[PDB]
Amino acid sequence: EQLANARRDYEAEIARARQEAAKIVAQAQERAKQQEAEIIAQARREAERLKEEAR
Amino acid sequence: AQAEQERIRMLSEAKSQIADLVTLTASRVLGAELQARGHDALIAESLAAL
């Protein structure tokens, strides 16, 4: 009975850790991609506008 | 930084084109003025150096 309980506890703990990692990793990538995309777009718009103004 | 570099290169190019045009205009003005003043006036000056 104790061995079966340990097996059930190990499976639940591993699944909980796996679920925790997936949610945390996805949030970091989503936030970084959203933040990085805005960085490139902001510079691209300014560069195009500045080139016409300087000319 | 990119905008300033592109503007600086364009500004330098414009100055060189303007200076070349300014020099050409000055040369044409000098040539006509010397012809009106007589090209046979500096011949004696050239002989002095020789």
Coordinates of N, CA, C and O in Angstrom, one line a residue:
Chain A
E1 N 0.8 -1.2 0.0 CA 0.0 0.0 0.0 C 0.9 1.3 0.0 O 0.6 2.2 -0.7
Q2 N 1.9 1.3 0.8 CA 2.8 2.4 0.8 C 3.5 2.6 -0.5 O 3.7 3.8 -1.0
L3 N 4.0 1.5 -1.1 CA 4.6 1.6 -2.4 C 3.7 2.2 -3.5 O 4.0 3.0 -4.3
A4 N 2.4 1.7 -3.5 CA 1.4 2.2 -4.4 C 1.1 3.7 -4.2 O 1.0 4.5 -5.1
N5 N 1.1 4.1 -2.9 CA 0.9 5.5 -2.6 C 2.1 6.4 -3.1 O 1.9 7.5 -3.6
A6 N 3.3 5.9 -2.9 CA 4.4 6.6 -3.4 C 4.4 6.7 -4.9 O 4.8 7.8 -5.4
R7 N 4.0 5.7 -5.6 CA 3.9 5.7 -7.0 C 2.9 6.7 -7.5 O 3.1 7.5 -8.4
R8 N 1.7 6.8 -6.8 CA 0.7 7.8 -7.1 C 1.2 9.2 -6.8 O 1.0 10.1 -7.6
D9 N 1.9 9.4 -5.7 CA 2.4 10.7 -5.3 C 3.5 11.1 -6.3 O 3.5 12.3 -6.7
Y10 N 4.4 10.2 -6.8 CA 5.4 10.6 -7.7 C 4.8 11.0 -9.0 O 5.3 12.0 -9.6
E11 N 3.8 10.3 -9.5 CA 3.2 10.6 -10.8 C 2.5 12.0 -10.8 O 2.6 12.8 -11.7
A12 N 1.8 12.2 -9.7 CA 1.1 13.5 -9.5 C 2.1 14.6 -9.4 O 1.9 15.7 -10.0
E13 N 3.1 14.4 -8.6 CA 4.1 15.5 -8.4 C 4.8 15.8 -9.7 O 5.1 17.0 -10.1
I14 N 5.2 14.8 -10.5 CA 5.9 15.0 -11.8 C 4.9 15.7 -12.8 O 5.4 16.6 -13.5
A15 N 3.7 15.3 -12.8 CA 2.7 15.9 -13.7 C 2.5 17.4 -13.3 O 2.4 18.3 -14.2
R16 N 2.4 17.7 -12.0 CA 2.3 19.0 -11.6 C 3.5 19.9 -11.9 O 3.4 21.0 -12.4
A17 N 4.7 19.3 -11.8 CA 5.9 20.0 -12.2 C 6.0 20.3 -13.7 O 6.4 21.3 -14.1
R18 N 5.6 19.3 -14.4 CA 5.6 19.4 -15.9 C 4.6 20.5 -16.3 O 4.9 21.3 -17.2
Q19 N 3.4 20.5 -15.7 CA 2.4 21.6 -16.0 C 2.9 22.9 -15.6 O 2.7 23.9 -16.4
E20 N 3.6 23.0 -14.5 CA 4.1 24.3 -14.0 C 5.2 24.9 -15.0 O 5.2 26.1 -15.3
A21 N 6.1 24.0 -15.5 CA 7.1 24.4 -16.4 C 6.5 24.9 -17.7 O 7.0 25.9 -18.3
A22 N 5.5 24.2 -18.2 CA 4.9 24.6 -19.5 C 4.3 25.9 -19.5 O 4.4 26.7 -20.4
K23 N 3.5 26.2 -18.4 CA 2.9 27.5 -18.3 C 3.9 28.6 -18.1 O 3.8 29.7 -18.7
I24 N 4.9 28.4 -17.3 CA 5.9 29.5 -17.0 C 6.7 29.7 -18.3 O 7.0 30.9 -18.6
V25 N 7.2 28.7 -19.0 CA 8.0 28.9 -20.2 C 7.2 29.6 -21.3 O 7.7 30.5 -22.0
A26 N 5.9 29.2 -21.5 CA 5.1 29.9 -22.5 C 4.9 31.4 -22.2 O 5.0 32.2 -23.2
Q27 N 4.7 31.7 -21.0 CA 4.5 33.1 -20.6 C 5.8 34.0 -20.9 O 5.7 35.1 -21.4
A28 N 6.9 33.4 -20.6 CA 8.2 34.1 -20.9 C 8.4 34.4 -22.4 O 8.7 35.5 -22.8
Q29 N 8.1 33.3 -23.2 CA 8.3 33.5 -24.7 C 7.2 34.4 -25.2 O 7.6 35.3 -26.1
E30 N 6.0 34.3 -24.8 CA 4.9 35.2 -25.3 C 5.2 36.7 -24.9 O 5.1 37.6 -25.7
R31 N 5.7 36.9 -23.7 CA 6.0 38.3 -23.3 C 7.2 38.8 -24.0 O 7.3 40.0 -24.5
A32 N 8.3 38.0 -24.2 CA 9.5 38.4 -24.9 C 9.2 38.7 -26.4 O 9.6 39.7 -26.9
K33 N 8.4 37.8 -27.0 CA 8.1 38.0 -28.4 C 7.2 39.2 -28.6 O 7.5 40.0 -29.6
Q34 N 6.3 39.5 -27.7 CA 5.5 40.7 -27.9 C 6.3 41.9 -27.6 O 6.2 42.9 -28.3
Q35 N 7.2 41.9 -26.6 CA 8.1 43.0 -26.4 C 9.1 43.2 -27.5 O 9.4 44.4 -27.9
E36 N 9.7 42.1 -28.0 CA 10.7 42.3 -29.1 C 10.0 42.8 -30.4 O 10.7 43.6 -31.1
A37 N 8.8 42.3 -30.7 CA 8.2 42.7 -31.9 C 7.9 44.2 -31.9 O 8.1 44.9 -32.9
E38 N 7.5 44.8 -30.8 CA 7.3 46.2 -30.7 C 8.6 47.0 -30.8 O 8.5 48.1 -31.3
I39 N 9.7 46.4 -30.4 CA 11.0 47.1 -30.5 C 11.3 47.3 -31.9 O 11.8 48.4 -32.3
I40 N 11.2 46.3 -32.7 CA 11.6 46.3 -34.1 C 10.7 47.3 -34.9 O 11.1 48.1 -35.7
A41 N 9.4 47.2 -34.7 CA 8.4 48.0 -35.4 C 8.6 49.5 -35.1 O 8.5 50.3 -36.0
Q42 N 8.9 49.8 -33.8 CA 9.1 51.2 -33.4 C 10.3 51.8 -34.1 O 10.2 53.0 -34.6
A43 N 11.4 51.1 -34.2 CA 12.6 51.6 -34.9 C 12.4 51.7 -36.4 O 12.9 52.6 -37.0
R44 N 11.7 50.7 -37.0 CA 11.4 50.7 -38.4 C 10.6 51.9 -38.8 O 10.9 52.6 -39.8
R45 N 9.6 52.3 -38.1 CA 8.7 53.4 -38.4 C 9.5 54.7 -38.3 O 9.4 55.6 -39.1
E46 N 10.3 54.8 -37.2 CA 11.1 56.1 -37.0 C 12.2 56.2 -38.1 O 12.4 57.3 -38.6
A47 N 12.8 55.1 -38.5 CA 13.8 55.2 -39.5 C 13.3 55.6 -40.9 O 13.9 56.5 -41.6
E48 N 12.1 55.1 -41.2 CA 11.5 55.5 -42.5 C 11.1 57.0 -42.4 O 11.3 57.7 -43.4
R49 N 10.5 57.4 -41.3 CA 10.1 58.8 -41.2 C 11.3 59.8 -41.2 O 11.3 60.8 -41.8
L50 N 12.4 59.4 -40.5 CA 13.5 60.2 -40.4 C 14.3 60.4 -41.7 O 14.8 61.4 -42.0
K51 N 14.3 59.3 -42.5 CA 15.0 59.4 -43.8 C 14.3 60.4 -44.7 O 15.0 61.2 -45.4
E52 N 13.0 60.4 -44.8 CA 12.3 61.4 -45.6 C 12.5 62.8 -45.1 O 12.8 63.8 -45.8
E53 N 12.5 63.0 -43.7 CA 12.7 64.3 -43.2 C 14.1 64.9 -43.4 O 14.3 66.0 -43.8
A54 N 15.1 64.0 -43.3 CA 16.5 64.4 -43.5 C 16.7 64.8 -45.0 O 17.4 65.8 -45.3
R55 N 16.2 64.0 -45.9 CA 16.3 64.3 -47.3 C 15.7 65.6 -47.7 O 16.2 66.4 -48.5
Chain B
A1 N 21.0 57.0 -35.0 CA 22.3 57.2 -35.6 C 22.3 57.0 -37.1 O 23.1 57.6 -37.8
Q2 N 21.5 56.0 -37.6 CA 21.5 55.8 -39.0 C 21.0 57.0 -39.8 O 21.5 57.3 -40.8
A3 N 20.0 57.7 -39.3 CA 19.5 58.9 -40.0 C 20.5 60.0 -40.1 O 20.6 60.6 -41.1
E4 N 21.3 60.2 -39.0 CA 22.3 61.2 -39.1 C 23.4 60.9 -40.0 O 23.9 61.8 -40.8
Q5 N 23.8 59.6 -40.1 CA 24.9 59.2 -41.0 C 24.4 59.4 -42.5 O 25.2 59.8 -43.3
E6 N 23.2 59.0 -42.8 CA 22.7 59.2 -44.1 C 22.6 60.6 -44.5 O 22.9 61.0 -45.6
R7 N 22.1 61.4 -43.5 CA 22.0 62.9 -43.8 C 23.4 63.5 -44.0 O 23.6 64.4 -44.8
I8 N 24.3 63.1 -43.1 CA 25.7 63.7 -43.2 C 26.3 63.3 -44.6 O 26.9 64.2 -45.2
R9 N 26.2 62.1 -45.0 CA 26.7 61.7 -46.4 C 26.0 62.5 -47.5 O 26.7 63.0 -48.4
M10 N 24.7 62.7 -47.4 CA 24.0 63.5 -48.4 C 24.4 65.0 -48.3 O 24.6 65.6 -49.3
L11 N 24.6 65.5 -47.1 CA 25.1 66.9 -46.9 C 26.5 67.1 -47.5 O 26.7 68.1 -48.1
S12 N 27.4 66.2 -47.2 CA 28.7 66.3 -47.8 C 28.7 66.2 -49.3 O 29.4 66.9 -50.0
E13 N 27.9 65.3 -49.9 CA 27.8 65.1 -51.3 C 27.2 66.4 -51.9 O 27.7 66.8 -53.0
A14 N 26.2 67.0 -51.3 CA 25.7 68.3 -51.8 C 26.7 69.4 -51.8 O 26.8 70.2 -52.8
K15 N 27.5 69.5 -50.8 CA 28.6 70.5 -50.7 C 29.6 70.3 -51.8 O 30.0 71.3 -52.4
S16 N 30.0 69.1 -52.1 CA 31.0 68.8 -53.1 C 30.4 69.2 -54.5 O 31.1 69.8 -55.4
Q17 N 29.1 68.8 -54.8 CA 28.5 69.2 -56.0 C 28.3 70.7 -56.2 O 28.5 71.2 -57.2
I18 N 28.0 71.4 -55.1 CA 27.8 72.8 -55.1 C 29.2 73.5 -55.3 O 29.3 74.4 -56.1
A19 N 30.2 73.0 -54.6 CA 31.6 73.6 -54.8 C 32.1 73.4 -56.2 O 32.7 74.3 -56.8
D20 N 31.9 72.2 -56.8 CA 32.3 72.0 -58.2 C 31.5 72.9 -59.1 O 32.1 73.4 -60.1
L21 N 30.2 73.1 -58.9 CA 29.4 74.0 -59.7 C 29.9 75.4 -59.5 O 30.0 76.2 -60.5
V22 N 30.2 75.8 -58.3 CA 30.7 77.2 -58.0 C 32.0 77.4 -58.6 O 32.3 78.5 -59.2
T23 N 32.9 76.4 -58.6 CA 34.2 76.6 -59.3 C 34.0 76.7 -60.8 O 34.7 77.5 -61.4
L24 N 33.1 75.9 -61.4 CA 32.9 76.0 -62.8 C 32.3 77.3 -63.2 O 32.7 77.9 -64.2
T25 N 31.4 77.9 -62.4 CA 30.9 79.2 -62.7 C 31.9 80.3 -62.6 O 32.0 81.2 -63.4
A26 N 32.8 80.2 -61.6 CA 33.9 81.1 -61.4 C 34.9 81.0 -62.6 O 35.4 82.0 -63.1
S27 N 35.2 79.8 -63.1 CA 36.1 79.6 -64.2 C 35.5 80.2 -65.5 O 36.2 80.9 -66.2
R28 N 34.2 80.0 -65.7 CA 33.6 80.6 -66.9 C 33.5 82.1 -66.8 O 33.7 82.8 -67.9
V29 N 33.3 82.7 -65.7 CA 33.3 84.1 -65.5 C 34.7 84.7 -65.7 O 34.8 85.7 -66.4
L30 N 35.7 84.0 -65.2 CA 37.1 84.5 -65.4 C 37.5 84.4 -66.9 O 38.1 85.3 -67.4
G31 N 37.1 83.3 -67.6 CA 37.4 83.2 -69.0 C 36.8 84.3 -69.8 O 37.5 84.9 -70.7
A32 N 35.6 84.6 -69.6 CA 34.9 85.7 -70.4 C 35.5 87.1 -70.0 O 35.7 87.9 -70.9
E33 N 35.8 87.3 -68.7 CA 36.3 88.6 -68.3 C 37.7 88.8 -68.9 O 38.1 89.9 -69.3
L34 N 38.6 87.8 -68.9 CA 39.9 87.9 -69.4 C 39.8 88.2 -70.9 O 40.6 89.0 -71.4
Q35 N 38.9 87.5 -71.6 CA 38.8 87.7 -73.1 C 38.3 89.2 -73.3 O 38.8 89.8 -74.3
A36 N 37.4 89.7 -72.5 CA 37.0 91.1 -72.6 C 38.2 92.0 -72.3 O 38.4 93.0 -72.9
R37 N 38.9 91.7 -71.2 CA 40.1 92.5 -70.9 C 41.3 92.2 -71.8 O 42.2 93.0 -71.7
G38 N 41.2 91.2 -72.6 CA 42.3 91.0 -73.6 C 43.3 89.8 -73.1 O 43.9 90.0 -72.1
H39 N 43.3 88.7 -73.8 CA 44.1 87.6 -73.5 C 45.6 87.9 -73.7 O 46.5 87.2 -73.2
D40 N 45.9 89.0 -74.4 CA 47.3 89.4 -74.7 C 47.9 90.3 -73.6 O 48.9 91.0 -73.9
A41 N 47.3 90.3 -72.4 CA 47.8 91.1 -71.3 C 48.6 90.3 -70.4 O 49.6 90.8 -69.8
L42 N 48.3 89.0 -70.1 CA 49.1 88.1 -69.3 C 50.3 87.4 -70.0 O 51.0 86.7 -69.3
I43 N 50.4 87.6 -71.3 CA 51.5 87.0 -72.0 C 52.8 87.6 -71.5 O 53.8 86.8 -71.4
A44 N 52.9 88.9 -71.3 CA 54.1 89.5 -70.8 C 54.4 89.0 -69.4 O 55.6 88.8 -69.0
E45 N 53.3 88.8 -68.6 CA 53.5 88.3 -67.2 C 54.1 86.9 -67.3 O 55.0 86.5 -66.5
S46 N 53.6 86.1 -68.2 CA 54.2 84.7 -68.4 C 55.6 84.8 -68.8 O 56.4 83.9 -68.3
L47 N 56.0 85.7 -69.7 CA 57.4 85.8 -70.1 C 58.3 86.2 -69.0 O 59.5 85.8 -69.0
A48 N 57.8 86.9 -68.0 CA 58.6 87.3 -66.8 C 59.1 86.1 -66.0 O 60.2 86.1 -65.6
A49 N 58.2 85.1 -65.8 CA 58.5 84.0 -65.1 C 59.6 83.1 -65.8 O 60.4 82.4 -65.2
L50 N 59.5 83.1 -67.2 CA 60.5 82.4 -68.0 C 61.8 83.2 -68.2 O 62.5 83.5 -67.2

